Each structure stands twice: as structure tokens, then as C-alpha cells.
Amino acid sequence: LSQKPVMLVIRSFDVNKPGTQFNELKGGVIGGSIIQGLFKVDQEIKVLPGLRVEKQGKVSYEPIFTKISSIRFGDEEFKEAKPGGLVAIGTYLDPSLTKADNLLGSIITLADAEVPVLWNIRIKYNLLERVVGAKEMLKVDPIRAKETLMLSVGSSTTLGIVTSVKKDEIEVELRRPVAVWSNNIRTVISRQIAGRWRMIGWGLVEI
Amino acid sequence: MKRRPRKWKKKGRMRWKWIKKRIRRLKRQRKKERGL
RNA sequence: GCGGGGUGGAGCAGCCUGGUAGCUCGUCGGGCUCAUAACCCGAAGAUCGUCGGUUCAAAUCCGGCCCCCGCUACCA
RNA sequence: UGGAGGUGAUUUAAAUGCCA
RNA sequence: GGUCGGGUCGAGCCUAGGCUCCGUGAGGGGGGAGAAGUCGUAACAAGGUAGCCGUAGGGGAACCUACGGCUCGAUCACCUCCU
RNA sequence: GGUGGGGUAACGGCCCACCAAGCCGAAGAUCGGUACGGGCCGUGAGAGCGGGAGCCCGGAGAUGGACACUGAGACACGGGUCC
Ligand SMILES: [Mg+2]
Ligand SMILES: [Mg+2]
Ligand SMILES: [Mg+2]
Ligand SMILES: [Mg+2]
Ligand SMILES: [Mg+2]
Ligand SMILES: [Mg+2]
Ligand SMILES: [Mg+2]
Ligand SMILES: [Mg+2]
């Protein structure tokens, strides 16, 4: 419980049933598990990346403050989520921000805390040995850049392209920033195979 | 674009307006496209 | 719990309202242009899964059987 | 003698062509 | 001549420092030339909707619409200006 | 650039201590790129254009880089040291 409590989300939904009156209205539920730290109902927090907005003519996001409306694992009553299991955290936000798995792989930490966001990300990557998950296993090629590859950041994900392809690391340009609580967090690279994006290396994010 | 008006004559080529517009879609690119 | 079509090479039209598989892409061939494609028209073409019932009489109304099987008990 | 300017009008469906 | 001190000019070496001198080298986007491959008809006449320039938006491709300008645009009706 | 000084055969920021803000620059500063210069040769109607190995008067190197001895004469091609 030393680094910043981060819940690396996997699900996010809206409790409000179709036809719910404006009196028992709820925020959204956002659901992960507490690996570093512990989260609590009514706590100040910021979610990342969350919301994207047009600020000065380019593309960028907004880390979003709130507090928790309740915490639960299903159907029992508790109030402060400790480590262990996908915990569900219902918040004070808008629900339309959360439905349809918009922020799949969200991250939650404190609205007074530190997790960075970078359009250009440097990642030390290790090549995979063969085409694992497929019928057919062909050689792993040393490539040049400009190819478009899928980079999944822990529970986050993005596309990426590059201009300097160093031997061991990669300087990838994106369209959406990262959720990187500290060093060498596990973001994985997959290359298209026949519409199936399979592994071509495991990388760790240096910042 | 520092016009050179020998090209509009449309003789053995294509219109000029609709070539300018397409060169923009590549200069805007090699400027944006990892030309950073 | 069920429940649906049970249709030509292909869209299946058409089913209580009952006699002409009903047009449409496609296959043969005939017309127009110089010649092609578009365009025009004859021909092929299944005959309603199938055993039946009801029905003077049928996919037309009702059932045996079976083809394929399409919806059966999620919001922190 | 020939223009030199202006206002209006100005019509279904009609694709393409080896060889010296 | 020698040896100790002090001072003096000075190559090389050596850390670290970006610059320029490169054998290469990893995906690339175009580019020039082959016009019995494939897709369509925008350009030339009033080219079957007139064309062509500046900005903007869209589009499997040549291309299409939106306001402001010129004849390097053809006829009928009608004027008006001069010779 | 100035005052005042040591130094070489000799004047000189050539070097030294003091004193102040001067110097050049789009009539092309600086930095990059190429070349040994001058008598002259090649061509051309002439106006030019292009070349300046071979002969003579200049200027510089002695495997790269540094430094001294001797003599009028230089840091010495067939003399001397160090890297
Ligand atoms: Mg001209
Ligand atoms: Mg024909
Ligand atoms: Mg028409
Ligand atoms: Mg045309
Ligand atoms: Mg036209
Ligand atoms: Mg004008
Ligand atoms: Mg003096
Ligand atoms: Mg120079």
C-alpha cells in the first residue's frame, strides 16, 4: 500500500435501467481491482484518460475528478475497497461517459496524484520467438518503421507508428495518451496476422 | 502556390485546381506524418 | 414452454380469400447497331419436404412423420 | 459597308472500337 | 656533464562534449519508363449538365456541389452602341 | 587605440603591465567550396570565352607532427634529437 492507489479498470457501466425516473438517478460504475493502495467511497479521485476535448485546435483529453457513490463486489455492503478482486466503484460523474465500455482499461488514482499522459511513448520491447496462437508459425522479421501496430498498455490500448526504430526500444506516436503509474509497466505489441493481431513482443514503458 | 500558367491548357493532362487540392493532401501529410 | 419456411440454378413472391408456382437475377436462342455492352422477346426452368386429413375441387383450411433448424430465465 | 457591346432565353434516356 | 628545487614553450594521450566525415539498414510513401490486364468516360463541338482560376467540403478514380471573376465559350429572341 | 616598458640585426600588440570602448560589415563581414601564382599556350571575324604540368623569374615539403646544435648563410633532402 505504498505507491499511489491505482485501480486499473476493466469494466464500466451505468446502473440506470431504461425508463428510470430522475429521482433515483446514479453515476457510473467503474470497475477494476486494487493492486497498489486502497480506494474509498466519497474519496477525491481522478480518472484517466477518460474524457477527450478539443483544446487549442489539436486533440487531447481531460483527467476527470469525482468521488465514489458506493463500492461493492456484487451484492454485499461494504464501503472502502482494499486489495483483492475486481471491485466496482460507483461515482459522481455523468453516466454517458461510462456506458458501452468507452474507457475500457480506465485507470483511477487520486485527483491530487501522479500518473502521466504522453502522445509519444518510449517503450523497451522484446521480440517474441514464434507465431504462438496460430495455425502457422513463420519467422519474426526485423522491420522498419511506418508500419501500424497495436500497443496495449496494461489495461490500456492504442495504435502506434514510429520514426526512429532503435534496436531495443521504440518511440511510438499515438492518438491517445497513456496510463503509466511508474516504470516499465507491461504494454504489449501485436502485429496483424490475417485480421488476427498476434504477439510480436512484450514491452515495458520507460519514463 | 507560385502558379505557372502553362499548365491550365488541359491539353494532354488533367485540370489544375483538382491537382493542387491533392498535393495539399500530401504536404499536410509529410508535415504531420511523423515529420516531427 | 416453444416456434418458423418447409419455394425453380438464385430474391422468394403468392397462405384464412380455392383451381393458371408468380414475378425477378441468372442458362439456351432469336431481334435491333458496323460490332460490342445497355435495350427487346420467345424458350428452358421447379410445380409448394413428404404421409395424409379437411377440401367437387388446394400451399391456400387441418394434422402424421421428418429438413434446416430461428427468438427459451443479466442492470455495480 | 462590317461589326462592336448588353438582356433574356437555349430540351427525356444515348457508354466504347484490333492489324499493317 | 651529473642530480634537487623553482619557473617556462609544449606534441601526444585521456575522460566527457555536441558538430560534420559514412559501409551500411531495417517499413515505407511517392517518381520515371512497358501500354492485348482490370475499372469507368472528365476532357476536344453547345462533348451530350459549357468550360477554366482563388478558398472550403466531399468522393472506389478520373471527379461533384457551394458563394465572388474572365473570355482562351455556341446558337435563337431582343436591344444598344459605332462605323 | 593610448602612456610607459623589456626584443630581435630592425620598426611594429611582435610580446608586458596599466588606461577606455573602439574595429570591421548588403559597394558583401564571417563561414563554407576549389586552386600553387606571373611571363604565356589552346581557340575566335573581332568584341570574348576557356587553360595556366614540360622552359625561365617567384613560393612552399622532404613519412605525419614538434624542437635545437654548428656557421655569414637556415631549424639543414643524401647532418642531429622526441613523440
Ligand atoms: Mg506564358
Ligand atoms: Mg449485342
Ligand atoms: Mg437529359
Ligand atoms: Mg464529355
Ligand atoms: Mg461537360
Ligand atoms: Mg475585374
Ligand atoms: Mg610604444
Ligand atoms: Mg576556406
UniProtKB/Swiss-Prot annotation, chain A:
So which domain of life are we looking at? Archaea
* Function recorded in the entry: eIF-2 functions in the early steps of protein synthesis by forming a ternary complex with GTP and initiator tRNA.
Quaternary assembly: Heterotrimer composed of an alpha, a beta and a gamma chain.
Per the record, the similarity remark reads: Belongs to the TRAFAC class translation factor GTPase superfamily. Classic translation factor GTPase family. EIF2G subfamily.
Q: What is this protein called?
A: Translation initiation factor 2 subunit gamma
- Which residues of the whole protein are included? 209 to 415 of 415
